[PDB]
């Protein structure tokens, strides 16, 4: 009855908050307030930076765990993809104000630094190929609409409303298929200095196309493999074969900044719902990003509808809600993050748990697969005994995900010894990841029982687990090839 | 979808089979033929027959076995419980029909063996004291219909309907508290017989109250504990206390034959439906009982109505059907069995599992028990791996037990040391018992390993299993006092 | 939720109970008793007796009513479809396992016995074939096709005495026998002649059986619904085409449990009762509902067991077969079958059924089962005691039945025969209006709606200041229901 | 369910946007071109302006309709509650941390500066005590009474100047000011006086708020319904009581979350909205739904989701602010939110929350929201593209909007004033009748509902041979809907 449960409205928060790092954030101190706040994964925008202005970061926030361990601090790295940018005015930020005049587009780099009022830049060299004469062109965050009036390449277009026109924005041309790659010969330099870094996940840029996610894959190469790529859904394409990407990528990211540019932003509210929740099917973790609190980049208050948003993306079934400019910038961080943590502890308190798990559990099986049976059969108990938590070790991540996925509600402690797996674990909702030092003792019986023990342990000190509570344990023993399938109910 | 489940309508039967053995049918030969086509318990009606008549039907089961072991046949002892009887006509079975002549119905034993027309017996003595003015009596089955006229004792009463008056019949009271105890003098020495001789199960019958069962618990005394009790609910007692009835026993017998003298026949409809329901729910197993295929009594054909309520039963959440002097005396022993099973096949094969397993996990937890929560949850890993077989060992039978509840749409293999659980354990439905006689090797975790392999065996000779299939396993490790909180998906 | 209902466990009876007439019930007074306890469709076995012998039948329900009215008693024909039958012993033999010769050539017609015996299909020698097994009365005698020598050669499986003109089932044999015979077609037109309200056409297999039935009743029949009787298997392979033109379906358990195997009959009644609340056509479960009763003033456990969840099913009609056209205790039976009928659909669930009865619909649905439905809705939420329902073709309160309601459906009407087969659905009450049409379709419909309100209020259905939905229609022209009128007493 | 259809994601929308007119849209063009992206109601903040500043918006109103009829432009009144308000400074001063006294005596009321701060709340001083926090200016200042002395200390908590004239939110305090002041009935006195159909009650508490608002309304009210705003704990923690008297309730976020902890709101919108849906009563969800919109053509993320959720929790009605009572962007604003609802609505579960409504009731329902559910229904079933309702009070289209159909509500009247209030609820779509009643309550009502058939031709709502439900009364004298049609167009 949602009416009843709606009409009848503490935990742990369970859902991460990725956070983009800018200069005013990239010091240890900071970076290390922001984890305080709630920051969990560490967000690296590879669209503006030199590789040291990131190599700084990747080490002030390898810093902030030494100066105060916390919880596993993750690294992602977003890829700046094919994106185009207008050149720089004739004298600094000028303010050429166009009301709805026409004017001519280069690509030459002859005006790339002198570009104004009549005459402009855009990064795509090929634009001249791929738009045609009808074309609509945004600029800057989607503000300024153009007309392409005639190719003439040096194409003709046309203003549609005011505002001036700035030095490098960004170039939206929805309806066009631009020939670009998914990975640029510079892209590629990014990811193989990523890896080379150890970024934990990457946040590839307006993919299209399955294929987009494989060559990120190869890309990543020998070292990636642990490296989790999260396709990035910018434009139409990414949404229109955004199922075939659903399968491979290892989760998407609810682009709305730019998706709100290609597809009319109103769209953006039912694509979402969707995404999220075409996902949330597939296993594959979502995260749901900008503007989540925009208005916090320059105010410690956030409006009624910001607030709503991040609890409503994750009412949706959002796994991540992280913050773009908000840190990157703002002149209140910490406190955007904390304003949303606080919301994401309420947001999962008006969840429907039972039932959801009912509907996902229902649109599956055909049939399930043996960790994944276990991981629903897991979840199920929690209901019933009413578990205070469930503790799962794994290497791979795998368990504790198809576990998130029938979401409980109660943690998911994991338990591992892989720091990789802890970091990029995240990037699940419920799961709490918590590295084991202790090398292996002498059984695969007595190791992981030391194991989920240690989890217990840990669970107690978050004040997770009461005194004498109850919980379930996940863990394998198949053949040879063991790989979940046992399921526990203890008590503590 | 009620109406599509329905609207679109081979395994093994799953629902026992019980067998009240009369003359025709004291007899390995027979006994076994009869356990060939589908026999399980074996009822031991109590109300006719001496120690030997008895003590010889005891032996020929064993003997059965013994001829050929099949599957572990059980051996119930249904107690013939504070029941009325008329005492014996003037010369024989005399042909006196009254057609709403009055008549006195005295207790003095005076006439006791000459009763009749003008004079009548009935066993309870005190009934004077009980009945009044304007009661009702019912003498077999509930045919003829008398009316107290007056307590003269020697009460005055008067015929209803015609029928003629014969010889030791069942005198039914409706309407009246007997003071009468479940439990008579001779009765517990068939008790403390039936634990002599090792009875499984015990069918009290004409239950009223908790205390009842109470009482035939400290009397079965110390031997009596691994004997089931199974409660008769017969009267309108059983049924108004059946609650707090339902709290003790160990299930309940729904007492159609005499329920439907009680309580007005078409509400034995209802009466039936809800107690079987009742007991679905607290977890004990229930039993549907008499003339569920009385036309077979005389014919190898039953009536489209016999085998309706067969199934129906079963559909309604019905453990066990038994049958009655259908096999006590009938022409068509063997036949009715075979009948009886092949409707049982079909009836569970119309079911509703995985919304009725919800229904039952709703109705539930509060938190559910540790024991309990493993089997809803081994359950639930069921529909979802879809798993053609789940082994469970236990001793006590309680395990096997809560997995039945949440009734799967798979067998139930359950392997057991205990020769007494794997008999009374075929009161639980989708039950197979399998008695290991391997005495334990020298662990708790190679043993049950040993063992829980070994149910994958027999499962494997029972076609139960096919070659590269799924299986859930249910096993114990609790801290000192375990007793399962383990599931184990695997594959065979 | 069934769990939750099931754990907890007077209105009036709201499923019709059919009655065959035999001889010890042949009579007004009799006939009368029988309608007091219940009785409401009359059946009529044309299976044995001749055109006197029901006609006398015909008449005494008719005077029944004379006697006293009660309720609209409807007549249905059964006519006795392609079955087998065999020959007369020698002089008025119990096969233990021997062997024996099956002639169809008269010869032995009134002379067959153990090394011999007769069958009416005389084409058999070619749908049989070796291996074909052959039930002989109530499907007790099994017999071998060992070899088609026509008189073709048979051995019996069972013991048993093979006594005279018994039924010859043999399952597994599509008979080229037609489903409406020469004969057949006599009692049809004899039927419509005397008006019998519905036909329960026997051994139906293809929808153009039923379309045959149809063409036969010709101009006259109309007005007659057709109630195919599904005994065979191909009455239920082909069951679905068939639904579609029948005017409802009648579980032929009897020589069903014949045809295919007796346990089965559990789950293709479940089946086809179901399939036919789907579509709306009511459905009839019959034979051997309490047989016992035949002999006896006591039903067996299984038998009321039976009646109830037939019920339960969704049944629409339960009738009684010999247990009054020849047992020892008719009334007693019907009684019987009335009381249990009471508790039975007192243990449905009605709000959640019509949930799923309404999702399996629309697509969408017609006009008037829209209102339908949507009177059916009403009902749940204002609480009504009663839904007036006026209509003359029966469809209305028809679709009303179907989304089931937790009340009565009083069905007010001018046609008397309408007002008759209405039984043949759940929950309807018909009542016949007399007084001619008023003035206006504005007046008229009215002064009908308000006299629903009094016999209602006369059977006790409806309270002092009650609730109530009243179902109406005014559609441009060719109107036909679509109005909804919620109500007060 | 809840997947599937998620994963599976044209029609008029059909939820309000009232729209706050400021200086820069008090003109018939600018509030046409508002009514024409989709502005409904008007809001009037009697927070600011004179009786001149308003009169002067109800007329340009009224003009918008001259210069272009379109739809019955509603006109609200939003009165200035009991709200509290700093003085004036020097000579028209950033606090770090420092404390600072707090007077209420006038002297320093165009002076205060620093060392000083004025507050409307002359009791104030009673009220508050030590350890109670005051928010400044959109809750931006906090600060923190160190000790009443009155002139009671108090200290910063944050940086940020301190302005003159801003709103001083003090939670935690249970301020003993009415609901209704001296000036405030003036304000209702007048808007009555120029007809305003609803008014916003701001900062209820109990229901005797309402109760109050109620009688100061008096005679010339009635018609005008009550909007409690719930802006404080008090609005929430009674608002059951308050729900019951009330005719609808404002979901008052902006003060609001200065009140509850900002996160709190969207547990607490979630659920009055829905507390409000089961009541029947319309809701309207308000402030910064589109903020940035206020100096943009580009609306956040975060925005457009905040109102298509709002829409998507059951909103009746999504206002907006200062995004058009001063914004250099207002038709874009509206624009896009009503682009925005056309989504919202468009990914909503009718059929499933239809039943969750029905089944939240009845016990039992009352006749005219027993057919309300019971029109609703047939909608569902016959997919019928319009239902046609005539109402007088608004009763009626109302319980049809909340058991909300996947269809238009249109609602045909007499009334000018409740043609307009219904905007006030989602799905209604008014329509003036002008001509005069015919001769009978059986012809006019017609002539009204085939009325209602035109306009949705008009409005593309009906094709040519559609299907469409007509709600319409007729009991014994007090006749108050009871009737449903299903019809084709
Ligand atoms: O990391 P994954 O893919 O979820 O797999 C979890 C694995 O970790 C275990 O729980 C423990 O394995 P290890 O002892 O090797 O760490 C296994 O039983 C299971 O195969
Ligand atoms: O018989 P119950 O009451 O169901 O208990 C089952 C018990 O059998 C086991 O599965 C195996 O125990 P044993 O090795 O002693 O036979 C235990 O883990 C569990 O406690
Ligand atoms: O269900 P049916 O048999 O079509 O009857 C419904 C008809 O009866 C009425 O309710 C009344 O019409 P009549 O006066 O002709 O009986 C019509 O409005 C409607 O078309
Ligand atoms: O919902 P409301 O405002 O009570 O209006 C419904 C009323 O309007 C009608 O449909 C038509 O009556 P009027 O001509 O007076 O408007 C009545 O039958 C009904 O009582
Ligand atoms: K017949
Ligand atoms: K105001
Ligand atoms: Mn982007
Ligand atoms: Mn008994
Ligand atoms: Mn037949
Ligand atoms: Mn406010």
Redesign the interface.
């Given at each position: 009855?949602?009416?009843?449960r709606?009409?009848?409205?503490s935990d742990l928060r369970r859902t991460s908050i990725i956070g983009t790092i800018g200069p005013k954030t990239n010091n240890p101190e900071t970076l290390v307030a922001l984890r305080k706040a709630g920051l969990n994964i560490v967000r690296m925008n590879f669209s503006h930076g030199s590789y040291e202005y990131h190599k700084s970061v990747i080490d002030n926030a390898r810093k902030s765990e030494e100066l105060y361990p916390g919880r596993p601090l993750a690294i992602a790295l977003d890829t700046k993809g094919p994106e185009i940018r207008t050149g720089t005015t004739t004298n600094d930020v000028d303010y050429p104000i166009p009301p709805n005049h026409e004017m001519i587009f280069t690509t030459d780099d002859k005006y790339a630094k002198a570009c104004d009022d009549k005459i402009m830049y855009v990064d795509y060299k090929n634009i001249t190929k791929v738009i045609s004469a009808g074309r609509i062109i945004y600029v800057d965050?989607?503000?300024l609409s153009f007309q392409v009036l005639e190719v003439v390449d040096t194409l003709k277009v046309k203003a549609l409303?005011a505002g001036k026109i700035c030095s490098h924005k960004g170039v939206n041309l929805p309806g066009t298929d631009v020939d670009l790659p998914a990975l640029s010969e510079k892209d590629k330099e990014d990811l193989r200095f990523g890896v080379k870094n150890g970024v934990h996940m990457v946040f590839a840029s307006f993919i299209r196309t399955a294929n987009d996610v494989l060559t990120i894959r190869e890309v990543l190469g020998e070292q990636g493999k642990d490296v989790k790529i999260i396709v990035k859904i910018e434009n139409q394409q990414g949404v229109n074969n955004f199922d075939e990407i659903l399968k491979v990528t290892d989760g998407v990211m609810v682009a709305?900044?730019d998706?709100?540019i290609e597809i009319?932003?109103?769209?953006?509210?039912?694509?979402?719902?969707?995404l999220i929740?075409?996902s949330?099917?597939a296993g594959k973790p979502v995260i749901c990003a900008?503007?989540?609190?925009?208005?916090m980049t320059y105010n410690?208050?956030?409006?009624?509808?910001?607030?709503?948003?991040?609890?409503?993306?994750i009412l949706?079934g959002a796994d991540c809600v992280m913050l773009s400019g908000e840190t990157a910038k703002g002149n209140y961080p910490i406190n955007a993050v904390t304003?949303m943590a606080?919301?994401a502890?309420?947001?999962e308190?008006?969840i429907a748990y039972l039932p959801?798990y009912?509907?996902?559990?229902?649109?599956?099986?055909k049939?399930?697969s043996?960790t994944?049976?276990?991981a629903?059969?897991?979840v199920?108990?929690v209901?019933?005994?009413?578990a205070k938590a469930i503790i799962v070790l794994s290497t791979s991540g795998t368990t504790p995900r198809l576990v998130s996925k029938y979401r409980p509600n109660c943690p998911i402690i994991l338990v591992t010894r892989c720091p990789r797996a802890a970091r990029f674990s995240h990037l699940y909702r419920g799961v709490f990841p918590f590295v084991f030092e202790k090398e292996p003792v002498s059984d695969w019986?007595d190791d992981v029982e030391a194991r989920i023990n240690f989890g217990i342990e840990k669970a107690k000190e978050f004040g997770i687990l009461k005194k004498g509570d109850?919980y379930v344990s996940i863990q394998g023993?198949?053949?040879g090839a063991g790989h979940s399938?046992?399921?526990?109910?203890?008590?503590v």
């Amino acid at each position: 009855s949602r009416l009843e449960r709606l009409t009848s409205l503490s935990d742990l928060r369970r859902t991460s908050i990725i956070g983009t790092i800018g200069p005013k954030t990239n010091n240890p101190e900071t970076l290390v307030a922001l984890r305080k706040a709630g920051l969990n994964i560490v967000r690296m925008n590879f669209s503006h930076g030199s590789y040291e202005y990131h190599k700084s970061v990747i080490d002030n926030a390898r810093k902030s765990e030494e100066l105060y361990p916390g919880r596993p601090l993750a690294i992602a790295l977003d890829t700046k993809g094919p994106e185009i940018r207008t050149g720089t005015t004739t004298n600094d930020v000028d303010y050429p104000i166009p009301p709805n005049h026409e004017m001519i587009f280069t690509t030459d780099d002859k005006y790339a630094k002198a570009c104004d009022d009549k005459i402009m830049y855009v990064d795509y060299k090929n634009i001249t190929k791929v738009i045609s004469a009808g074309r609509i062109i945004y600029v800057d965050d989607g503000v300024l609409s153009f007309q392409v009036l005639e190719v003439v390449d040096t194409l003709k277009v046309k203003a549609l409303n005011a505002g001036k026109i700035c030095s490098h924005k960004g170039v939206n041309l929805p309806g066009t298929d631009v020939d670009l790659p998914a990975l640029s010969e510079k892209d590629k330099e990014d990811l193989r200095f990523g890896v080379k870094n150890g970024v934990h996940m990457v946040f590839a840029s307006f993919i299209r196309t399955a294929n987009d996610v494989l060559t990120i894959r190869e890309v990543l190469g020998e070292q990636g493999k642990d490296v989790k790529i999260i396709v990035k859904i910018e434009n139409q394409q990414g949404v229109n074969n955004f199922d075939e990407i659903l399968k491979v990528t290892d989760g998407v990211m609810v682009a709305r900044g730019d998706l709100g540019i290609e597809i009319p932003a109103p769209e953006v509210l039912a694509v979402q719902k969707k995404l999220i929740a075409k996902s949330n099917l597939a296993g594959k973790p979502v995260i749901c990003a900008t503007q989540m609190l925009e208005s916090m980049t320059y105010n410690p208050r956030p409006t009624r509808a910001e607030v709503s948003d991040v609890g409503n993306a994750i009412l949706d079934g959002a796994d991540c809600v992280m913050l773009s400019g908000e840190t990157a910038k703002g002149n209140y961080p910490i406190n955007a993050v904390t304003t949303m943590a606080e919301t994401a502890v309420i947001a999962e308190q008006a969840i429907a748990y039972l039932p959801n798990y009912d509907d996902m559990r229902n649109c599956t099986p055909k049939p399930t697969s043996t960790t994944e049976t276990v991981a629903a059969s897991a979840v199920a108990a929690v209901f019933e005994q009413k578990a205070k938590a469930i503790i799962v070790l794994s290497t791979s991540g795998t368990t504790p995900r198809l576990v998130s996925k029938y979401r409980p509600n109660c943690p998911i402690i994991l338990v591992t010894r892989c720091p990789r797996a802890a970091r990029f674990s995240h990037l699940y909702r419920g799961v709490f990841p918590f590295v084991f030092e202790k090398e292996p003792v002498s059984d695969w019986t007595d190791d992981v029982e030391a194991r989920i023990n240690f989890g217990i342990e840990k669970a107690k000190e978050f004040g997770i687990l009461k005194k004498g509570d109850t919980y379930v344990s996940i863990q394998g023993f198949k053949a040879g090839a063991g790989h979940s399938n046992t399921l526990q109910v203890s008590t503590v």
